[model samples]
Target chain A: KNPKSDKFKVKRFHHIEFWCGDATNVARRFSWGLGMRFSAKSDLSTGNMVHASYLLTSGDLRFLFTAPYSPSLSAGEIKPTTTASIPSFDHGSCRSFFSSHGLGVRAVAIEVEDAESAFSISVANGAIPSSPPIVLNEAVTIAEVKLYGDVVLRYVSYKAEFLPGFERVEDASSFPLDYGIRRLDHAVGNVPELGPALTYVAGFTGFHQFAEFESGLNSAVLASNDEMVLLPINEPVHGTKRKSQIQTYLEHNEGAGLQHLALMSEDIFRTLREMRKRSSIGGFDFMPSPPPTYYQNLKKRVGDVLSDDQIKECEELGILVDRDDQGTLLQIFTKPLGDRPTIFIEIIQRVGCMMYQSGGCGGFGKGNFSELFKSIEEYEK
Target chain B: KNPKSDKFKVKRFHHIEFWCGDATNVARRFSWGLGMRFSAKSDLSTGNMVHASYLLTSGDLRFLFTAPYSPSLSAGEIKPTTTASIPSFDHGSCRSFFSSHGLGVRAVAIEVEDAESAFSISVANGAIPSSPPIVLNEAVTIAEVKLYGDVVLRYVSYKAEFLPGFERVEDASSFPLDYGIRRLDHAVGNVPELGPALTYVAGFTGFHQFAEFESGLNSAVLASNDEMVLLPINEPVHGTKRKSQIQTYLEHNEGAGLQHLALMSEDIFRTLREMRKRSSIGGFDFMPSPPPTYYQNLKKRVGDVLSDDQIKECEELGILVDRDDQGTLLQIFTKPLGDRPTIFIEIIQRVGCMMYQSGGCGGFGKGNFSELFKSIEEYEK
Candidate 1:
């Protein structure tokens, strides 16, 4: 809503960091199961005495997985002299985070025009700073501010390779096979209340409202000035026949946090098929398909946005389809990544709109939320 | 060992339970990586609101993985009405255990002739009781006593399938392909001191020393009356060129605990080949092979026990060869299962001896310890 504040621009999502119990195993799961390429690492072998971290990438998407070492073992060791002082590596906080949230996102890094100015502007506009801007090797600068629940918003302006401490994996064959997944489409967070959280984020980042919906929960989507970075905030609704899924996520995660990430796929059918082939192994287990009646009603609802063969493939693969005035979207969700029903993943493809257009193609799948909720309810039963 | 204590006999290992961060993913790793069959599970859907547990079995080998739910979410829910009261499910203890030892064995369950008598006898021998005997349906009984570090020695006399709470996984197709791994050959623990731990375990279980060796560390092997269960205790030796591997484990684990499990295979060649094929995919990464001089020296050391082709295969698979008067042992080790360099796995096969005889066909691999230590040191470097 504040046009003057838009001077601090966020280019796109740089990466997302997950604080987990076992970085090696979780990274391997993403690599072998999700087909992400292993790019870089920082661990004991790399003189990172405090924890182990792995960087995985697929096209423009990047994810960093980190797990802490025993506090007692690393108490007196030399700290990792890495870029962007990661205070979250403190063993006590990391352990507590994993205990409460299991495998949860700790930070969402966004590429910005200038990290220092972006951070100062946010703080000037009533943001609580988590850390000051840190310049690494005269090349890259990074800063952070507090976000909803325990997650943080990180700003980075980098001209170099990944952070300073990590070393390249060096094995050309280490890359996993691509499965059509290109980059992150959007990330959704579950909060206890939609109003205050939305206002707080919007005020600090100068993002304007992009979309809103009321399905299983109340949600408001906010976007960067260029509309390339979309973040949807969700809150549980009252008086439902069953407990709200957003409420369930808040309780399991111990607070508001990132609920799920949508990974953009150039071809969701091929992506889903490849992912399904590995699901029985170390891959992800997706939610069950919607009832047959939903597929039967799909043709009338979407109105020829998808072909008969594409719809048949969607039915076969348990994919859900929805359409907006801009275009159509095909999406499917995985079950919770770990034991608790907290965080999961979504594979989405947008059709019939330009890739660089505002809000991309089909929108945030607001039309499909009710169907997803019913399917999740049936699966929970 | 006291002769009167032999009245309470431990038949064999019942199962080993791991308290982890995510039981689902850990279970998948064991199922997809190690090729263990998914047998059963107890979780929220099964009305177990306390934690999620999965049972995996391969022949007589049973591994149970359990992860706790958010403490606040399940604070006042009805406790799981299972056979044995699992006090370790206390969220505080579970979280503390994971923080101290990322993924660790919490209990070593042993099949005993009588659970009540085993509990009484161990207590009479000055063992600290973790829990007294609990009978379920007047048909099965279980008990526990504190073991080294945070681990427990669980005694169970059961005629039922698994425990009371877990429901069977009905899909026959759910099981992973068998990889020749049969049962637990032995489990090793790393303690700060060897003598006290040895005496304490032997005094309670009535097991006698079966073997002793000094390699990278000082180790003593203890066995049950029927020789079906073997427990090796290891302690760091002072004045070595480098820190002992046992000491390293103790530091990383933050205390004494189970360090490695040796899974016996009827055909190690086939087992190792299949395991190696999955290594790059969601499976294990074995330790690097010893230098070429070790292969050249193999003929003079073992002398006709292994064929030339067998030695070449061992070199290719990084398997180590060692022999005692009774038989020969072919063994290979996987890297630690998680981020910590604490616990791992051993694939072992025995040749040229009776399966039912004491200590099986081959003795523990005392001769290969030096080579393993060197390889581990290289990997650590």
Candidate 2:
């Protein structure tokens, strides 16, 4: 069990915003390939003159993919069409970040009871102050603080709207079938050595490191007060002949950054099958199917935890299964998001069967590394 | 019989290249939604370090979607990772063009017997030279000239390679079904007023204006000597209470530009049915269905040109039909390429049946505008 304090009380996830050069296409890719619904958009036509944002929602999770009107705010003469330019002040830090890093997470907003108090507490606990709490119209107040690798933590308190400037817009397109991803389970990040970054996050946010794991690398999982949010941070260890994926991510992303997002899905079977169909026909690259040997070894490891039918099904779907004294957990990984190997996705299902309640060691694929590395190597040098 | 002359001789169609901010996603959209195969790609990894290009090819038509490595070549320090920046010299003139005009066609490559002769002839006859003919290694020669807008007409002579630095890359993904588009039939452009643009094209290229039509707007169709290549140019006319569609495109696209490309399909029934399936489930938008009154009038307009069964089939599929004493053309229009109403697609089938050897008049949709405008109106203000 974890204890909570008044100083660091984040109620729930607000949204994760990505600064992308092509936000509209990326949002469409997620909607068409991952079964997310395009819920909202804010652009020049909507009086948001600086950037165009597409908001996609699935279950309890929402992703805001935003792009600036122009890459350089001070470049040549702006065009007149809806593809016009925005003022320099509005471009802000996201421009340089996007130009340097390509598409990446810029901010993770968390819901708080009082934005001012959260900002004050974060600052008191040695957080880098990026922006002070400010009221946006009469509806919301937002404050930002810098985290590792240019990512910021936003404390937002809102009553009615998503934000003051964003109006809810309908998706002009629809998906053929909806996948079963229900909520954001955990977000993973990669760092140089993991010590300073993990310490800073846990110390500043006051989240306890509930679990730690090591296979070829090291990882620490931090969770919120009531187990609502889980954030796992991974770092590559030195002196291993096998190249670590975290180090490769740092090399390609140019520095430490987000590695993957684990989306929680209740129905793991349908979710993976739909994902398989989307990837095969839709040009999305998912993690390669696990070798039969891997599944054979998994069956040996799990012993009586998984039934013979369950093992056969996991083998068919390439779904990885992990079990311990608690229960069973089913997981699968998608290939890198695009050409870049920095970000990807993990779809996870934690099944605490009738006997065991806590579920099998909530972790980020300690059992699937061999399969993941084989697939990711294709995208690497 | 058709006779070819050196003065007006263009060998064949090569490929159309689009300058987009996100070439990868655009290529993926076509591959997944439209059943085009991902034929090749050129990027930093492929030694075309200047830009990333994704090539999608159907039967005989290929499209190269290219994007620069960065919007600004000078500002930031280059990263050591594979996502590194391109050199300033490599940025060329396309960066600013892409910054100004979102995604647009930058070049239409045409195969010719001699690239030097084609360049010299076009330049002598008033073509604005963008790039002079240059041989790359011993494999290919390329020459470019400015068209009406920023679009360039590239004359290329090749013996081995597709271009200078491009290598044939393999497609890593596969589709469940393939659509029946065999070749590109024609490409249409829009202008504020078509007078000078049409005159300039005809005068410089020596193409003849074979057909002309006026529905709500005016269109002039130009054809090559063998009638293998057709270009229909449209211009918005004055004194109309309802704004012309050409005028709408000219406004939204910011200037004169390519409006749509008509792809030739051998079996239009299957082509349209596949297209219908794709748009409904794959998030693609097609032009809205025409009112029943349109089908009623089309029956009267076509008279006995189309059989009762053919008429019934056209009405059921919402395929537009236009016929003359010469032949019959089955056509349909897709919604705009993206948010802009500028670029779209036209699917056409020309039947050369008994007694109609030349197949209904070789033209764009003239009789369909009354029905088309009603659907296109929903996208406009």
Candidate 3:
């Protein structure tokens, strides 16, 4: 009930636009793997699930095969298909296909506090806006955020006054999440020409140069600030200098794309307790899911940030643990998400630490990314 | 009343995999346009999706982007990162990014007559069994089906007794499917070289060629003695010619992928009545959600199949109508199910017709497909 004058106490993040071939596929895969329960049939007109506040359908996904045809433009200027088109809703089967197939972290949409102003700012500053602010509902409006060509920012959020809906909020001061994030962990991206793309993102996004390293995966530099961290991972453009992983991306992928996502949880110890190794988690087949023993002896090494109990549990559950200048972080990661197995995610918790040390910044999952890299080549082999 | 010799009748289709660099983006795009909704999450154990029955995660899809690494035998495996062992599940961000971005098409399993026997049959013919019969629940088993390369399939069913849950069983001579989906529709494969690939598939799968046409999009047709139709769609290759959209696809898409799906529904009139408009479906924004005038003349043209009231809303909404030799088909499509905007679904009801006169199938409402193609290209423009 305060005046609009408060300089708009804008948070760091509002939302992210994650791109995928299908939604049904994403939903189902997570359900079995993470014990994720379906929210409900949040079907919009197409019967497709529109996420909270930010649901809009443009009829973009594909599932079943399509027949051959000539483009209308080539044939002649034709009437555009309207929003109310039949099959306006994709068939359930198409949804199932995507839901089942490739799994990966695609785009990162950062939510913002203002839309009209943000829109003007982006346009004014040379940031290309694919589609302008489209206000679909009263609560949410999202603008396609593309910066420096490759990096896409989805500045999403509810009207400035609607911040009260987030039911869960806590102080994430230790994590440097002042950027509206519960945790400002780490993110990885890959590009063919690492220098230009990386520099472009760093320049445009206001991220700080966090770390720089030369690794076997490729030439990568870490950039971050108090709000966020990004590992600009890429392949050496010249064939001779390229690393195995980045090379494959340059060869197969179109161009630069996201490498991975790191999510920070509040408590590592408690999370690891119910990890894969635990019988309570539907048994031990959950391979990477660590056991309790890993967490038993962690307190002594990483300073007084997280309790010893937490470290022990993380180690037991096979989660990674290490200290950074900011604090110690406990992390776990999954494999690549695409059919080609390119991108992925990282679940992390900052126990008063900032940097993702332990050689992680240099490689995906402490060089473990190399492991999955081999499997993929083997499949092609 | 029947003998034990009777076998289960229903056949289940598990899933299909598309090999590309951006499953995460593809999955999300599908969610926006398709019938299904997807969420991102990953299973750490197998490095798969936790929620989706099949799971879609897009990170580290191919960690290495390579040209031709020195020590690697695979396409992208030139000097790999860490030169480490294969199958590393340590990637953190890649996991979640993919899990979040992937379409969540965990696996498309096809239910055959006999899982074990079929494997033996495929194995006898030199097909490698990637995995064994994986039971999802007591009711369903994933008969993982893999094709020549890494393309995956699954056989899902409710009961050991063929479509086991045993709910609806009707007579073939009795009220048939609005239009029975008697068998596999048509499956297309986009290949670089047509002649060799077609011959190879025929040899391996024991399929016979029904037609082979190479004009716009090449089709190496195969069928099971008229039971179902199978057509492998190939893109413009050496010595092959292509135009318009196909060219666009080749230029933009990462590589050859699934093009379209052509299924057969029973009643075109009744079928079209229930479906959404063309733009609602995909591949092309075929039609706008039906228009009001369309409903005004519905009974006049389709009085034989649909009542004036039956198609009232459909016509008013711009649902499409078509006819093939097999029968009249009321059809509509959804938007592209993936980010690339190439693949999509087609709801086709073959009402007692058997000819694929798609060439002759064009009208104000029906031809929305081709017009949609042009409009899409224009939109991109």
Candidate 4:
């Protein structure tokens, strides 16, 4: 039994928020490119005058894109006191954050049993508070703490459809096409060093080390008690033949921050096909595939987990495959979402696991790291 | 006879460039949303490490969207010295521009007979030079002068495919779906005062006054010698019952800048139909239509220029109609492209004119101003 596990329960990832220059367009990118629905909004029309926020969702996945309004231009009486009281609503802070990081994730929120208890325990264990716990109506409570770089970790306990001050998008015409994306499987972060970040998060959240790996970079994956929330923190390893990709992310992002999100899919072949169909119009471009020789040797490496036809299909779609003791994993990655090359996305599927399993079928694809790095290096060339 | 009208020869609008935070997504918004093809690009892949630029085009319309790279992270040596020598490639300036105004137009380029002579003459005639004439190759010559807000007026004499460093996009699958958009009809700017802005552009470009209007705001339309390029400058009129729309633009944009671009369409009904079809899937949201009474009276105001069926179609598509003695004009406006209420687009169709005529068919839609403003005011509510 792990002594540092299960101190506080994290139900799941509630949402992730991006601070950007054009929230509407970026939200549309997620809606059209990734097939997320325009679920809700908080803006001038909703009487939230300080900033414009758009919430997108697919299955259990939630993503929020927000852009600040000029204080002088947002002139009028703000109706919702909840909106006015948000700690991160300052225009100057939002502008400076975007200027520094371009377009990047600002907050990663997790649902918990009790937000107040989580905040109290985290602060007691030496976490720096970004905002005190605030109960927003009877249905919701929230608190935040500084994570790495300019990012924040938010704890939320809510029974409402969404947070206060947001209204459902009433336009039936804006419904999104179903792309089969299910939920966020894991989110990776890049840092200058791995040890300190791993220790900091473990101390506050009572997480335990789930796995570790070293290819061109050193990484440690931490997980919650139920293994529903996984965060893999990476740092550059010195004296490698080439510079580590994690270091490149740190430099482009201007500091340590969230790097990529792995989206879970039950049927990745259908999801990838739909995503690829939209790529020619306005969708994403995936990374280049590995060599044919790599696929020729894949069965020998993973030990007959996938049939020859499935392997051929994977090769055709640029998907990667790996296997752990528990199950087999299939994955592919998209290029950066914007020009800066800081944040990207991963599509993942797992096979051969039962519903009672704690961490789901597949492990974090540790055996595929070198091939992924080589593909990225070839792309950068 | 206008003395300064023909001093310098301008062929037409070459292109308009927007400096934004995410050029790729904004370019996609134009491609998938407005039906413009992805024509060319200049970025790290093309050895231009300073910024990423995407060129989009439809018929005679060319739009460029650019985003800067973090200097520290753009580690490779730049190959093209022409790209390295660009005056506005500084990262700090790009960041500050987005921080100040979000996403906006940075330059409006015009094709000229001789870029060198145009730059020299404008400098001699009281125009501040942003960049001296640079001969890019045997086929292309370019120069720039400061315009209103942070915008510049570019003078280009080019026979090349695009600019100095951009390469044509060769993907066969990425071709855009046509929406019948033909060309740029006119571009409008909002300033604190009309006289100074008009005088400044006229002094530099040798443009002559084409028309003027005063309803809720003061406006002056200036045109080139051939009447192919039109610029309407607007200023807020004081002591109005409601705040002038021009004033709102100036305030939200933080200064004077381009407020809208009017795209000429041969068949606006088909264009509007295509654009509205994509509105639920990553497209634009047009302004709400005027009341039923406005369309009932449109035939009386424009004097039988449109048939009963055409008027009914216009009402269905939220299109506004107006007419001058020469012909009839139909137009519709989109909401602001970003969160900030600044730059937008206008779809326009001119009726009853010959190819032999100089200024197409209809003049600027001066009679539609009040109704348009009322629709906008209702949307604001």
Candidate 5:
């Protein structure tokens, strides 16, 4: 029996909060381009003056986009001591984060049975407490720990609307595009040292390192008790001859930060078809075409799982394919979310597997990295 | 003969540049909601390392949206002197502006016959030169002068693509929604004192005040010598006991800034009808419905200009109507572009008469403001 599973009861992602220049428009990009519905919002009009947050959802996926009202506020010059009632979540925290990182993920909150225990255990380890566990009314409890750089690992119980203060409002556009991308599979963060971050989660939260991707980097995939939540942590090590993707992320991101969010989809073909139409026709260019060899290897790897027609479709769309013996996975990545090649999105689909072993979808398709690395490096060049 | 015309020779709008968080996504909103086509982009892949910019066009209307690389960079921490070959146009300037103001208009570039003379004249008239006139390649000559806050007035000669360095890319999305909103009629900037701003344009760039909008706030409309470009300037004054829209803008914007852009259209009914269809069916609510009295007064005032069916249709669609001796303008405003009560858009259609006296289009319908002010205030509530 795995002792880690008995210790930590965290299941899925509660929400991912992105600190952006304007939360409303950022939310719109996801709504229009990514097929998320504009579900709710919290702003000055809603009584929260320190910053504005826009909440969006599709299936089990929940994403929150936030932006401060002023530049000085983004610099953390504004004190929560003045207006904020919920002192546990100092609103200025994101401002300081955004001041350094720009429009990127500031927090990754996970669903847990007991946030207090998670916080206690995490802090007892090497994790730093960003916000001590607090019961926000009878609805929810939350706690935060500093992850890499200004990125925070937050544990939250399910609540009404979004948080304590967010009002329920319908802000969907006239033609909100729905892509059918369902849930979060994993969120990857880049770091100089992966062992510390790995140890922090593994020791405190009862998470365990599942798979090591030895393609060319020191990458480890970490899993929670339920196998629902996965985090692939990567550090730029001497792997491939070309510049490391982690190293590039570090330079553009300016520090260690949340790198990419892998979103799951059931129908990989249809999901990517709409996305490809959007990229070619919509001018959004969510993902670029994969390298030539990727498809040849993909055919050999997952040829049994998907039909020739399906394989031909995947080849045409530039979607990557990988297998971990347990299942075959199909995936594609969006170009960087903004100007910097810092944060992006990955749409992933897993199929043909009856069960997952101890590792929970091992290696994250390291076979695809050489190809992925070139796709990124070429874009950079 | 106006000496200002002889000296300045400034004509019309070249482009309106907005500093946003993600230019690509932000451009998508305008592409889908406002029916603007994504036409061009400048990013790292295109060799612009400092920032990424997206260009969209509808009729003669051209819009440019930009976002920086990182957060500290967004806060103006990055030094342009280190990497930029162009000394005068410091890249960090916009980053600092956005860090404070969020998404905002940083520059309103004017089309000029001779950018050098316009630059010299404006600088001589107490305008601060943000950038001196310089030939960017052989295609274009551009210069800039400070307006209010971080806002700058730019002068540009004709170019090959857009700016000299920008590469031409066809970025239009599939089935791009075209509203046929046409061109820029007038772009209003909110200021405390109108005289100085008016004088800066009139004395230097050959624009003269033609109309005064003195309902509650002190406002005046200015026009270029050819009368193609119209600028309606507004300042908060004591009107209708309630807070001035200008006051709301100035307070939330943190300083004087571009309040709204009025885009001209031949068929506002068709443009707004599609916009309304999107709002109702597509679930993209562009403009909130007007008050009951708005229609009653509009019917009594311009029933002669519009048929009962037309008035009924406009009232149902939330389109506002204003009539002057010269013509009538059909207009509707989107909610603030971001969370702040600052910048929004006014889609305008001029119908009926042709000739406009000295003060361009009088008052942009002060009759509409009571409805608009209430709409904004109610939104805040």
Candidate 6:
């Protein structure tokens, strides 16, 4: 009977939020590009936060992202990459990083039907519920995430119906720009926080989470191998910086957070086409962020999995395939943002939708690949 | 081709970076929760913006959010919250936003098909092109945003042809984990600075330029009284403080940068359902986000356009419609991290995806009766 009505509430992901500078452009360009009409909320006023929002739904789980008040240089500098030189990394000589890369991802929005219910699931699986129940637009409330991991995910949604006699949508203006119910396609996890929330998510979501790798060695795939779509996620295996990748990441992103999103689709080709179509015009978009080496190893990797025809088919379809115990896994990776290059998404499909341990169906995996799975116990603590 | 190709170097929005001292749990949690795959490069030595990144993408656009060096925060026991009372936002109440909401958006990403072409295009469009062109991943490099309106169309995307030559699957690993790409989805934007990059993008990509809406005035057919999908955006015509929504948003977040994303779809009902099926249970999703007042006036202001049948349709579909000029728009929004209420999204639809305008196109345009849009603008700037 109201916005709080559990029946009315989507039993999926609602919209997740990120801060952005641009509310209008995002509302118009990005939303429209994704096939939505922009319902720009002009008079929005919150104590803080409340950036541009986008909502995508597949049944009940939803996905969203928002521009922040002031994005960082890695996010999207309002100014130029003014640094004189890209500082040298300990591993190499002077590297023109800041100059080479710019404009990164700021938010990963994962929508859900009942945020609270979803939160419970995430927790059951090993998620650290950070945010508490927050009632906004009325009886509607959302709970967010907090904990250590490469990236972070936040939300626990509930309907006003659960509120019993809660008020109505009179405060519709306060509705999150992208709040709604939808499914969880894929949210990028910065597997840096080797353990913590990062590893926990893998156990909970039943994802074969870990670093995209080959033989537990470097360069088993590509020479440049930038976006190992199977980019092996790992913890700071050798850093004394403070904590392990798992620990460091959790601390950096505010006790666990969402890194990015790799939205799922029944038909990825259509989505690709849609993306290409959108790129043909304004609402300028980022290029297909291939990690440079993606192309170099394309032929080699696909060769190991699908037939020649299948490989070619994948190319034409703009889909990528990476190797795994399950065989070649079709995949894609987004570009890097900031120093913490945490990208979201691992769009995969087992031939039988049969979930197997990333390294193996659970033999305390390791070299088999996908580190998180093998290292779950450590992450949980 | 190099990492920075000349044709279309990685000049696009690369990634968004963040700085948080407490990178332990937060970072790791965010990574997995957000879906950022793992990257071994993100190590302790990388400070914070570890090499691991989330791959952000939309159609052609891509972005990443990195957590670079962790800045030491004021020593104090802190608690995060959805409300303004979080312990993080008090810089001695001198306006230092302690809550995570105060963190600014790092930056926005821009993609260019050809760095050389982009270099040339940028010049013509009032941009300061890359003088010599940075190189990376076999692509000529030209990535930077001078804080405001630098690139094209707010951001420009290009054909992602393996970054021109090849993608470095290996070097990506060598990228010090503190760097690299993350995730992608719909982009974001802000006001004031009017986003200097706004014009820059238009100039670079020649994407259709959008006109900023003037508030409290008749925009003609373009404007509507009810059911206005149009969102008014700005830094905010008001306050400046961490407690201030606009102030805090702009504080921690980079000034006027890409915020969140807007996931779109043709039918929200179906989209919502799919989301629910995919997401974990008990997320509390499936509930309407708007308060009662927002929907109460639906028919009076905007519903006047839709026939009773259309309204009935939305009701059945569970799609919330915001009546506009001769039409109605269905949409929803999300709140920010951990229910901190920092950012969010908007889901919407227009008639037949018609060559819709703010007016006929489901007028998210008409100044909302609440002037919610204007309030948003005044809050930041």
Winner on TM-score between 1 and 3 is 1
TM-score for the first chain in candidate 4 comes to 0.92
TM-score against truth, every candidate: 0.93, 0.82, 0.41, 0.92, 0.88, 0.35
- Candidate 6 lDDT over A1-381, as tens digits, reads 011212112222334343322222223333323333222231223222223233333334333333333223224322133211111101111011111211223223233456666566667666665554454445455554443332234443445321222212233222222212123333434433444433454444433333333222121110001111221333434434434534444444443344444444445445555544433222123324433234334565456545766555555544554454443344444332223333233333222224432221111123323332233334343
Best by DockQ: 4
Tell me the DockQ of each model, to 2 decimals: 0.56, 0.28, 0.06, 0.59, 0.46, 0.05
- Clashes (candidate 5): 14
Using TM-score, rank the candidates from best to worst. 1, 4, 5, 2, 3, 6
Tens digit per residue, CA lDDT, model 4, B1-381: 334474587999999889888888888877888888888888877877678899888889999998887666555544344354244456777777787788888888899999899999998887888878877766688889987877888888965478867888877645766799978888888899888888888888788988433455788878888788888888998778878888888888888999999999879999999999888788888998787777767777764677788888988999988776777788999988888788999999987766554563577777787665554554434
Considering summed lDDT, which 10 consecutive residues are worst modelled in model 2 chain B? B80-89
DockQ-based class of model 4: medium
RMSD of candidate 4 to the true fold?
Answer: 3.9
Native contacts recovered by model 1: 0.58
Error of 6 at A193 (Å): 23
For A204-282, candidate 1 gives per-residue lDDT tens digits of 8888887433445988888887777889899999778878999889877899999999999888998999999878666
Q: Judging by TM-score against the true structure, name the best candidate.
A: 1
**How many clashes (backbone atoms < 3 Å, residues ≥3 apart in a chain or on different chains) does model 3 have?**
211
Candidate lDDT scores, in order, read: 0.81, 0.68, 0.39, 0.81, 0.71, 0.35
Retained true contacts (fraction), each candidate: 0.58, 0.23, 0.09, 0.64, 0.59, 0.07
Residue pairs whose backbone atoms clash in candidate 2 = B327-B360, B328-B360
Where is the poorest 10-residue window by lDDT in model 4 chain B?
Answer: B79-88
Better of 2 and 3 by lDDT: 2
lDDT of 6 by residue, B1-381 (tens): 012112223333333333222222223323322223323222334221222223323233232332223322223323321111111122232112212233334334344455545556556556653233444334334444333321112223343422222222243222221111122323454444444434444444444322322322221111112212122233443432324354444544434433444444555555445433322211112344434343344556556556756655555534566544344556544345323233444445555334433323454434453534333444344
DockQ of 3: 0.06
lDDT string for model 4 (A46-67, tens) is 8776788999998899999988
Chain A TM-scores, candidates in order: 0.91, 0.85, 0.59, 0.92, 0.86, 0.48
Could you give candidate 3's per-residue lDDT for residues A1-381 as a string of tens digits? 112221122344332233333443343333222322222222222222222111111111101111111122123322243221111122232222223223333335555567556655656645566556655445666555454224455455665322222112122201111111134345566666666765555544444444431334555544433333344555544544544666655443344566665545455444334333222211112235433333333444453765655455455656766554444545676655444445555556654322443223222234333333433443333
